[PDB]
Design a binder for this molecule. Structure first.
Ligand SMILES: *[C@@H]1O[C@H](CO)[C@@H](O[C@@H]2O[C@H](CO)[C@@H](O[C@@H]3O[C@H](CO[C@H]4O[C@H](CO)[C@@H](O)[C@H](O)[C@@H]4O)[C@@H](O)[C@H](O[C@H]4O[C@H](CO[C@H]5O[C@H](CO)[C@@H](O)[C@H](O)[C@@H]5O)[C@@H](O)[C@H](O[C@H]5O[C@H](CO)[C@@H](O)[C@H](O)[C@@H]5O)[C@@H]4O)[C@@H]3O)[C@H](O)[C@H]2NC(C)=O)[C@H](O)[C@H]1NC(C)=O
Ligand SMILES: *[C@@H]1O[C@H](CO)[C@@H](O[C@@H]2O[C@H](CO)[C@@H](O[C@@H]3O[C@H](CO[C@H]4O[C@H](CO[C@H]5O[C@H](CO)[C@@H](O)[C@H](O)[C@@H]5O)[C@@H](O)[C@H](O[C@H]5O[C@H](CO)[C@@H](O)[C@H](O)[C@@H]5O)[C@@H]4O)[C@@H](O)[C@H](O[C@H]4O[C@H](CO)[C@@H](O)[C@H](O)[C@@H]4O)[C@@H]3O)[C@H](O)[C@H]2NC(C)=O)[C@H](O)[C@H]1NC(C)=O
Lengths: 97, 49
């Protein structure tokens, strides 16, 4: 209720996967992913960290992710609703196509 | 008491860390290390033989 969590900072680290958690929403393409929160064979992971005012670090948990190369499943920045074919185009000055 | 360990040889191997256990005493620089003898996520290891 009262936000006593102001002192503790908890965030994700960088694991061994060949991508990043914050850049999965970009237009990245895969075949299957199947995230999980328990250990399974053949799967990279992102550790979790907890700290008090950036003095002493400790590891708390992890997130386990699998994947397989493909061209079927694509991430999206945010869920646009009400359309039938996701596309966008901005003209006449610099963009990132 | 009597050194019966004369036959058995036990030593460390080379793991997956990008350094060595016998050369950690040299002038090597880090930020934190925090050795442990139990499994924790995101950590290399030295086997025993
Ligand atoms: C390659 O070329 C093709 C050429 O066909 C491109 O496809 C066309 O792309 C156009 C541009 O998007 C489509 O036109 C409209 O796009 C609008 C996008 O919104 C932005 O732009 C408008 C422009 O005024 C702006 O106001 C708005 O704020 C946004 O900035 C859409 O909103 C719009 O949808 C509306 O119109 C359609 C069509 O209805 C029209 O025609 C009817 C007759 O068939 C007529 O009775 C209507 O009065 C109207 O004149 C309509 O279906 C939509 O309905 C919405 O609401 C209902 C609920 O009532 C909902 O159920 C439904 O799902 C909709 O949400 C809405 O009123 C236009 O789509 C154009 O439609 C595209 N044509 C085709 C065939 O796809 C293509 O993009 C190009 N590709 C590339 C890569 O460039
Ligand atoms: C380089 O690229 C950039 C891309 O970022 C581009 O920037 C665009 O610039 C154009 C103009 O040059 C901008 O278009 C303007 O849009 C104005 C309207 O925006 C207001 O109104 C929105 C809703 O309109 C209501 O009312 C109308 C009727 O008036 C109605 O039809 C609508 O349905 C609706 O009910 C409103 O949503 C919007 O707020 C958005 O943004 C805020 C943040 O600011 C956000 O918090 C909101 O949630 C929301 O997303 C805003 O309040 C419009 O008034 C304006 O018109 C003037 O210019 C035209 C010429 O263009 C004149 O003819 C006219 O007389 C006015 O003087 C103009 O059309 C556009 O928004 C910019 N951004 C994008 C992404 O396109 C640059 O132009 C490019 N070029 C250069 C050189 O930089």
């Amino acid at each position: 209720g009262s936000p006593g969590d102001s002192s503790w900072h908890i965030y994700l680290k960088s694991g061994t996967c060949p991508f990043s958690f914050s850049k999965l929403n970009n237009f990245q393409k895969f075949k299957t992913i199947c995230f999980s929160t328990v250990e399974v064979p053949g799967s990279c992971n992102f550790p979790l960290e907890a700290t008090w005012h950036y003095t002493s670090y400790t590891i708390v948990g992890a997130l386990y992710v699998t994947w397989s190369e493909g061209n079927s499943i694509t991430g999206v920045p945010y869920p646009v609703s009400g359309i039938r074919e996701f596309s966008n185009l901005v003209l006449n000055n610099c963009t990132k196509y």
